[PDB]
Write a protein that binds this ligand. Structure first.
Ligand code: ADP
Ligand code: MG
Length: 192
């Protein structure tokens, strides 16, 4: 796990790091899940596997929590389903905030952007609402959902800046591959 950047955003300490989010020193980690919380691949799989030891198991636990927290088998952009980090609790990660970003498929518009923004802000406010002081995010929609990485990071930062809370003291963006990390770093530098 390598921290590539660290700046102050309001009263929050924002960090950019390269590595596996399931190993980040945060109380809550965000999962870039699909509307059904079916963790079949991407970071969702990694997180599901690291929490329950078996992705299929966490997929079921997530569906239950969602049904319990919303009354349906799906969530909308902005809505966050909370589930215990289980096996990750011994690392300091207590919860997993499940959020759903848009499916860009290589496109970009104000509509897609607004959905990704909600997908990023939702977890922050959920962290505020719960009193969690530290939270780490993955590059929501930058993988399978094909949203431009640079656009993703810009949107993530816009959310972090517009966010208004007192409990959240630390926020991080964790990027898996080095190539993408450098791209994210450039955005962080020119935005701050
Ligand atoms: N273990 C992991 N930790 C942090 N980021 C990860 C991990 N595995 C994948 N990622 C990154 O998370 C981003 C989200 O992609 P993906 O998981 O398919 O979800 P989405 O459907 O939102 O695109 C990608 O940029 C991917 O490289
Ligand atoms: Mg959509």
């Amino acid at each position: 796990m390598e921290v590539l950047f660290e700046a102050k955003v309001g009263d929050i300490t924002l960090k950019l790091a390269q590595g596996d989010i399931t190993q980040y020193p945060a109380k809550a980690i965000v999962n870039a899940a699909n509307k059904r919380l079916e963790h079949g691949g991407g970071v969702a799989y990694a997180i599901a596997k690291a929490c329950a030891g078996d992705a299929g198991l966490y997929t079921e636990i997530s569906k239950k929590a969602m049904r319990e927290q919303f009354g349906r088998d799906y969530i909308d952009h902005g809505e966050v389903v909370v589930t215990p980090a289980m096996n990750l609790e011994e690392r300091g990660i207590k919860y997993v905030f499940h959020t759903v970003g848009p499916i860009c498929s290589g496109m970009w518009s104000e509509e897609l952007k607004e959905k990704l923004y909600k997908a990023f802000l939702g977890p922050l406010e959920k962290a505020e609402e719960m009193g969690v002081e530290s939270i780490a995010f993955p590059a929501v929609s930058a993988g399978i959902y094909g949203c431009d990485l640079e656009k993703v990071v810009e949107t993530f930062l816009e959310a972090v800046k517009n966010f208004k809370g007192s409990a959240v003291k630390e926020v991080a963006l964790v990027i898996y591959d080095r190539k993408s990390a450098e791209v994210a770093l450039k955005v962080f530098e020119r935005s701050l």
